[PDB]
Amino acid sequence: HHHHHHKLNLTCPACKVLFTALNHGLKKEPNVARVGSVAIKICKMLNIAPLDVCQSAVHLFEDDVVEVWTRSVLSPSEACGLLLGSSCGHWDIFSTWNISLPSVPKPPPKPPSPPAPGAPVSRVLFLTDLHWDHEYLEGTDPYCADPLCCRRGSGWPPNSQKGAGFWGEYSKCDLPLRTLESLLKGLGPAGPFEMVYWTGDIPAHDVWQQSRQDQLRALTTITDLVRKFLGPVPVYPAVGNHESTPVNGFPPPFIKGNQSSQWLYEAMAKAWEPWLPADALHTLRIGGFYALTPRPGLRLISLNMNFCSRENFWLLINSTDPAGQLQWLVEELQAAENRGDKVHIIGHIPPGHCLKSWSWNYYKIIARYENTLAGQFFGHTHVDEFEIFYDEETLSRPLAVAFLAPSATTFINLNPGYRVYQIDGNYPGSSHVVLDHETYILNLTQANAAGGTPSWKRLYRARETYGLPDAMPASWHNLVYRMRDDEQLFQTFWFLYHKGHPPSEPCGTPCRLATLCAQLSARADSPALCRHLM
Ligand SMILES: *[C@@H]1O[C@H](CO[C@@H]2O[C@@H](C)[C@@H](O)[C@@H](O)[C@@H]2O)[C@@H](O[C@@H]2O[C@H](CO)[C@@H](O[C@@H]3O[C@H](CO[C@H]4O[C@H](CO)[C@@H](O)[C@H](O)[C@@H]4O)[C@@H](O)[C@H](O[C@H]4O[C@H](CO)[C@@H](O)[C@H](O)[C@@H]4O)[C@@H]3O)[C@H](O)[C@H]2NC(C)=O)[C@H](O)[C@H]1NC(C)=O
Ligand SMILES: *[C@@H]1O[C@H](CO[C@@H]2O[C@@H](C)[C@@H](O)[C@@H](O)[C@@H]2O)[C@@H](O[C@@H]2O[C@H](CO)[C@@H](O[C@@H]3O[C@H](CO)[C@@H](O)[C@H](O)[C@@H]3O)[C@H](O)[C@H]2NC(C)=O)[C@H](O)[C@H]1NC(C)=O
Ligand SMILES: *[C@@H]1O[C@H](CO[C@@H]2O[C@@H](C)[C@@H](O)[C@@H](O)[C@@H]2O)[C@@H](O[C@@H]2O[C@H](CO)[C@@H](O)[C@H](O)[C@H]2NC(C)=O)[C@H](O)[C@H]1NC(C)=O
Ligand SMILES: *[C@@H]1O[C@H](CO[C@@H]2O[C@@H](C)[C@@H](O)[C@@H](O)[C@@H]2O)[C@@H](O[C@@H]2O[C@H](CO)[C@@H](O)[C@H](O)[C@H]2NC(C)=O)[C@H](O)[C@H]1NC(C)=O
Ligand SMILES: *[C@@H]1O[C@H](CO)[C@@H](O[C@@H]2O[C@H](CO)[C@@H](O)[C@H](O)[C@H]2NC(C)=O)[C@H](O)[C@H]1NC(C)=O
Ligand SMILES: [Zn+2]
Ligand SMILES: [Zn+2]
Ligand SMILES: [Zn+2]
16 A cells, blocks of 8 residues: 555565575574584684583584574564664564553552561571582592583693582582582581572583483482472472573573473473472473462562573574563562562572563562562572662662572682571461571682591671661662772671682672672663662
8 A cells, every 4th residue: 555656576575585595594404514613713713611511512502593693683573673663563672671560559668567575487498599510520620621610521630630529619610419419418507498499500511512301310319408408398499591401591482392491491380299289280391480379478589690691692582571471470479469468589690680671671670579579589699798779769778688699619710618597487477487597608719638537607687797777778789888988897798609619819899889789780781770889
């Protein structure tokens, strides 16, 4: 219904035909091998790390990345839409998207009330980033050329240098199974616990040679070891980013067949059946997230933060609220608000590391349900730190805080560690909020020492060391700016940051202001949050 006397519509289908031809030529197996076998020769041409890795890294990524480009950019409706305009398609890739909040008016912000005298306190264990390395070996080179050392294939160290420790090593290494058994055995004094939050990243960083059997092997092995030492204590876990292979590869639910992540989510639903109820397992299989009620007046929500990860290449195809998760979260929160319940959110990748649009909608959801939210717990960063949320309009009022627990693994150059949270206990009228938290470590210098002992000691208690009236958002907000001025205090945070094993290089003024900026930045791509630091 368009009027012309010079236009040739020969260019619109010529585009569609031509890209449609590419895809058919890329799927051909004899062509895929051509794109792999050349890659080995290219890693020498681009001055890349050991080529032996390249012969493996590019192999696993190829089939999945290609499919994503054919389904995203080289999709006829997508590419031709970029060149010729709305006439021959639409360019949807990484388009901005929003979420709709319910029509329910937002209640006035009510600060939680301090716990009454004689109010019980519950202890919550927090395991994150275990990263079991089946191929960990003692005495092997910790400074190999591969991305991951201390394992079979990294060879032995030269000049009679000191090999890898028996319990781990300060380097780009992961943990042997024994060191995780030691962690779970020494939970006597740190307990008792009412429940455990377990935010994934079970398999090691040997991403280049991870079959699906090795990923399910790590799943059931550790899930069996954890259930063994926690007994009747329920463990509520979340999906990490090393759980699938290839790493970070989590195709949303709309993708079907062998290439979907059904192989993973359905194996989880079997390993985690003793912990999760029926309705929770349903959504677990589909998209790897779920919600449940661990105790009266509290709602637990486990998000699959892979559907926000830059590293998840499958999100090109459609990066709008993958799996409908944010829409589902809003429904869960809003329902809780009506019930008068509070909510705990657990995930792997902190919201500050997500895609800009995803993170901005999460940030606005938190603010809307500030009164309903009682805790946010995440991991991934392998480090002890936090992220403060502010009001969407002015970015001046702290209204929620997310705790990024440090990792059980040594990757990279850290002490093993775990984290126990003290929360307002199980009783009607409880705020369910975090009251304080404790961090335990395994000083490797001691354990690996001759005749050493594997003793898990408490590194510190949160309020005690930082002198905090409470674990509310306003107290961490104050702490950050306190460290902006007090150098000794920051060096304490810096020391605990790395679980008590700081780097050799001192952290100067530009390194400090950057690290504090991270604590205020729960919204990705938002420099205004650090206007007061620099
Ligand atoms: C890219 O993905 C976007 C994300 O949506 C997901 O992506 C696709 C691939 C599917 O996997 C889909 O299941 C995912 O949710 C996508 O934008 C989103 O599109 C969906 C629909 O495709 C919108 O979801 C909701 O649709 C329902 C329809 O009724 C449901 O009920 C029936 C009967 O029980 C069931 O059989 C189904 O579950 C049906 O889905 C709407 O009812 C719902 O309304 C919401 O909003 C109103 C506001 O008036 C609220 O009051 C309600 O409580 C609901 O919360 C949704 O419309 C979804 O809204 C939409 N996203 C946004 C942000 O709007 C996009 O289309 C994809 N793009 C491309 C090019 O493929
Ligand atoms: C320029 O040409 C393209 C290509 O379409 C084809 O090319 C012409 C030379 C003629 O031979 C056409 O008969 C022929 O379709 C046009 O794109 C095409 O648009 C139509 C509708 O806009 C698409 O058809 C739809 O198909 C669905 C599913 O069957 C139906 O439900 C719809 O009712 C509708 O029929 C067609 O798929 C699409 N072609 C491709 C390859 O995607 C384009 O519209 C044309 N330019 C103008 C200005 O008309
Ligand atoms: C996504 O949201 C942005 C901004 O948030 C919305 O708009 C604010 C102005 C305010 O009304 C908030 O409560 C909303 O949640 C949208 O910004 C719109 O931008 C258009 C043009 O881009 C502009 O003309 C309007 O001022 C804004 N609002 C409306 C209703 O159009 C943005 O359009 C939304 N969509 C996307 C894809 O980003
Ligand atoms: C389902 O897929 C797996 C994986 O193989 C394919 O190629 C991988 C490199 C991956 O990137 C995806 O493109 C594909 O799914 C198949 O298992 C592989 O093949 C055998 C299994 O017996 C084994 O030697 C390989 O190591 C497996 N690879 C991995 C990464 O686990 C499996 O056979 C496929 N299922 C069906 C029915 O074909
Ligand atoms: C971890 O253990 C090592 C070894 O026992 C401790 O290192 C000692 O620390 C102080 C100096 O800071 C002195 O006792 C010695 O000079 C250090 N010895 C060595 C070999 O480094 C270390 O302090 C412990 N750290 C923690 C957090 O437990
Ligand atoms: Zn005319
Ligand atoms: Zn990790
Ligand atoms: Zn991670």
